[PDB]
């Protein structure tokens, strides 16, 4: 889900400039949820903008943001020419995991048929059912089935029973969050408090951007406890200021790089155009707009696949020295010694991040000599897996906010384990709450299906492995072999990408099929699992990864001349076994596409369709063997008329149940 | 693939009776699959059996054993009424590997046109190329494309180049196997050693049954290294009469006798003058042991298939797995196979479960309760991947090897891997005498009876119960877990009846089979205790029905796989009354929200989901760590019924190995 609001204080914006800013803000957040969208602004058509803050307009529609962008326009009642010197507008895109994605369930929610309070919510209220029964007895009627409505009907209940005629908007919000259980990130707007916004969070991201040609009064807003000129963030001499409430930084970087990341239970409030926190640090974002632009590519996913030569380099930058063959991960310098005195490695993650652990488990066992266990976070929690004080627990999360991975982290901390975060998001929950960690530095990933995040996690775990064995004489040559492979890896990725057209041709032979089996073993078990997940996610074909050594134990019965099959046969120590699996598939009349090495002349002669990738070190080959399956999934989706950036039935980053 | 030889020594039998015994032996071996079979026996129609011992007749044929039986009785020049006081007949079912199926490539393979030596073989001789060249240079002409023929030609080469006129049959075979490379189980017969048999193995099972109305000299045959006298071999004491049964599978012996000797690698067993001795290149020996197997356990009975039988008899097989091991009278568990090792096991620091296929799913199905009751780390490994990674293993690891057959290559090699590293090894098997039961430090026989069906049904649930019982032993000294143990054991007490209740819903499962009759895919979703149920159900439907069924961990839906859900994709969800109930409901709402209309396997009394879901399979409630047994049976039946509807033979393997090398 996504939150975005635009508060222009004494910065004249017409009603069109504001709506185009709310839509443009949701477009930056659409990848977090694109089942429905909505906006909330001030209505009325009075030239004097002051006589219009008493009328709230809600435009909510089902579909992506482009369905709302057109619903907002071509309306017969809203005059898009009213100049507003002061105005507040809130927007939201929703990931409808439950129920229908109807406009009544989309945000902003309302508290009554006159819109006295409207709120946009990211998260879940674990006791909204109790709140719903309490509010219905006092005289409040509910319309939607969402848990967000109990937040709107309640902020109005605290307003209908206040003690003084002018209780601050903060006091009303403070009484609400005290009755809310679970996680949430809220942004309120009310007719009674014109132009005033309130932003509180608890277990969900919520920052506040600021732009102004004037100087700011401070760069460290002091948190308060239940507000003068030496307490609020505001322009000194004049009033020109623009705020940008948002649950992510991509929606704000386009307008300014000065945000204030709030914290749990911090109740920010903009009053008279002054930002004050109740119960901070105005900082510069380290992100360029180009990082969240498609560039010359037709889709984010295509960009992020073809940029893997660069993102791999950025992952190793300032960490790998090829002249002296040294590896240093600054994020682990103060813990690497204690990590080596531990007795077991546990990798915990979901989805593609889990596959990155599968892809590096073998080399981690080799170079650390420690037991390495790889766990799906959801199952890890269901079983109450035993964890001990001398366990090192890794948490792989591109977003750093995945619910199951994050709860596994707090589970392992409670048991005294040493926790390490492998993240792609600075300041994320998982990067903060782990004892140490590594930022893979692959750049923002906008496509729902992770591509560069996987290969960057892969490389990051390999670098950790190289550190763990940098004091073993017997492993020096093995380290050199691996590091030379890493030096040559960016160019070999480029070689794989040059086969883009050859992959597209094979896709034309498969897009009509209902199923495909992807078979691999050893280092390429993860490859066939990740490839199967990608084809599932964006093409909707029934693709499944099958461990090659397991074919003879049942799954081989599903192979015939009609069943599409992709096999991975690389020149490592399992080559002979992979050839036996291939012979078994052929005996069953299978006609598989084989991903193999360029020099594998035997395989290339005896197989019609082969994807010939260049050879790398065995423990790095998984990076090269997965890219063709990334490309294949992309082309299959295009052939089937689907969107590769917005696959049906989900969005990016699972931050709730 | 199947070996059977019958040696009657001073037990008069007619040629008819001998041939009927050989055929009946192969009938017990057909379930393993084969493309041809043959028999070898003494020819000639001289009324005195002693003169016919120099004429070996062969009857081999491509096809089913029934056709072979017709060919036997269809011999105008063969008199079936000659009585043999002493005779050795051998029989074999072949699964072609080298040389296409044909009469010439069938067993027994002969050493020359006069059949001086014949041999039946299970396995593959790797260096059969080199051996063939050598024997051709010495003047031996080959007539078949089988690797086996090199064995028959080589034993005649040793005979033709023997130093003394009275070199033993054993010595010849010893010299043969010392030149062979690979895996083999062999039985030899020769006109130069009438009435004698020699059996040997390396990497393939071979056993010997024995029957005599007279007392036997011993129940422990001592090994002889390179004097064969009355104190060193097996034989009837006061009289000569005795019968021997060589076989690669006890199923071909059990109807005649339950006293068997399991040979080990490089053993050379020989019957000379009706006396069985075991040669080899305190005092080691081979035990004559009693099998508790019965012929009825390998017969369909009133069922139309072995798959149907082994599914529907699971109330009985679960009871057999628990017999003598669970005392509901005082809530105690005793696995006799672990008595001398339970103490060490409790001092170890990690459990590793290693297996392939459905046996691996048995580990996944019990991982959680093992973690709970042992409080140790529990790692579940697919044997093939375990080997590829050179997984770290330590002296204080307890490694379990789950295998119905006890012979699966990758599982067995994982066992030997762990032994080299000093780990305590434990075998969970269903085949007495198998490699994994022998080479583990200790083990548990799950005692589900032989599994004749192609797919693992009762073996899975019996493994499930066996691992739960082990878990109950590991926590029997913990006060805080007494209640939890009682709850689980009362569940085991009620489990056989709860299985019958599930089996009584067979009609409801058929209705579901007709709904999926035309479908090409089905997603089976679950989590926690029922993750294994999804994986095992998906494997069954793949293996038996040949449709693309896949098990999906419910917690992973929102991470990608949920994109497959729409109004067309068939889905089966498992929602039971355990601690993951709310999370499973969430997954159900996620599926429905995307136009999915799934079939739900749920508890009988889950009124909410039964009303909000059209088709529900309503199983009875049990302990959470036992529900997996009840929720998997409907998927076993589903796979069975779908295959029947689509005209498939559920007792037909299909899953064949690599093609036949024609050379
Ligand atoms: N990338 C998606 C699959 O293409 C999804 O599986 C993703 O990996 C999963 O949601 C985990 O997200 P995270 O890396 O941010 O924790
Ligand atoms: N029987 C099959 C399951 O349907 C197969 O997966 C089997 O479980 C696997 O081959 C392992 O065999 P094992 O139990 O004899 O070791
Ligand atoms: N390799 C031998 C025996 C195979 C077997 O039946 O096990 C053959 O193909 O004839």
Numbering used by the authors:
A (entry chain B): 2 to 227, 241 to 293, 304 to 681
B (entry chain A): 2 to 227, 240 to 294, 300 to 681
Give passages from the manuscript.
In the first step of the HP, GFAT synthesizes d-glucosamine-6-phosphate (GlcN6P) from l-glutamine (l-Gln) and Frc6P, releasing l-glutamate (l-Glu). GFAT contains two domains: the glutaminase domain responsible for releasing ammonia in the hydrolysis of l-Gln to l-Glu and the isomerase/transferase domain, which catalyzes both the isomerization of Frc6P to d-glucose-6-phosphate (Glc6P) as well as the transfer of ammonia to Glc6P to produce GlcN6P. The active sites of the two domains are linked by an ammonia channel, which forms when GFAT engages with both of its substrates, l-Gln and Frc6P. The main distinctive feature between prokaryotic and eukaryotic GFAT is the feedback inhibition by the HP product UDP-GlcNAc, which inhibits the glutaminase function.
We wondered how the presence of l-Glu and GlcN6P would affect the structure and co-crystallized GFAT-1 in the presence of both product molecules. The GlcN6P-bound structure formed the same asymmetric dimer as the Glc6P-bound structure and a linear sugar was present in the active site. Compared to human GFAT-1, the GlcN6P-bound E. coli structure shows the pyranose ring GlcN6P in the active site and no electron density for the glutaminase domain is observed, although the full-length protein was crystallized. While in the E. coli structure the product might have already left the active site, destabilizing the glutaminase domain, our structure represents the last step of catalysis, just before departure of the GlcN6P product.
